[PDB]
Amino acid sequence: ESADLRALAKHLYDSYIKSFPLTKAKARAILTGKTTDKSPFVIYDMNSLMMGEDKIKFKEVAIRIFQGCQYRSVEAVQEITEYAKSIPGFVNLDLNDQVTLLKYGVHEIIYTMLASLMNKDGVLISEGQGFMTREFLKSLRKPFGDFMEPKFEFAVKFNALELDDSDLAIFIAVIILSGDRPGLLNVKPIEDIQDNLLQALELQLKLNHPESSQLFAKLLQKMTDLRQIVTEHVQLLQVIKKTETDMSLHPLLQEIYKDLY
C-alpha cells in the first residue's frame, strides 16, 4: 500500500545521502550564496585554471580538463554502483544483468546528477569548491569545446522541475532498473522492481509537490532525453579516441563504452 512505497522512498533517500558526497541541497546553497561556507574558486579562463590547481586534483588545458572530467566520472561510477547495491532486489539479480544495468545507466545518472551542480552560467567541481564557467568550457578548442554544452542545455530544462534529493533518489533508481537495456538475460525481475520504484516515485511526487501536478509525467519524458545525451556523448568520445594522440581513456570507462550505442 502507500506505506510500503513511503518506506522504499525513505530507504532510497538514506542510501542516496550516504552514497553521494555533494547533494542537490548543498549544491544550490553554494550556487545561490545562501550558505556561510567559503565561496568556490571561479575558473573562467586559462589563467584562473592554472591558479585553480591548488583547490582541485590533477599537457594542453583542453586535454587536462578532459582527464580531470575522467577521474570524477570514475568516482561517480563507483558512488552510483554502491547506490545501485542498496536498491532492494538489485543484488539478487543475475550479476551479468547487474553489470548491464550499470553499464547503460551510469552516464544517464551522471548527467541527471550533474544538473544538480549546474546553472545556465556554470558547474560546481571538486565537491563545490570550484565553479567552472559555461563560456570557459565552450571556449575550449574542438572537439572538447562541444563536450559539456549539451549537458548544460539538458540541465537548464531539468532543473525547472525543482526536484529535491528525495525525488532524485527514486528517479535514479528507476533509470538503473530499465528492463529494455540491450543484452539483458532476465527482463522480468527488473521490470518487477522498476514497477515498484515508479509507483514509489509517483507517490513521492504527489506528496512532496502537491501544488505541482504530473511532475511525474514530464519527468518520464526526460529519461529519453538522457539516452540521447548519452548517444551524442558516446559519438563525441568516438571522435576524440580517433582525432587525439596524447590522451587515453581510463580503463573503467573503456569497459563501459566498449560495444555501447
Partner: peptide, 11 residues
C-alpha cells in the same frame, strides 16, 4: 570482460 564493474559489484 567488465572486470572492474564485477570487482565494484562484489566489493
Amino acid at each position: 570482460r567488465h572486470k572492474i564493474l564485477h570487482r565494484l559489484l562484489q566489493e
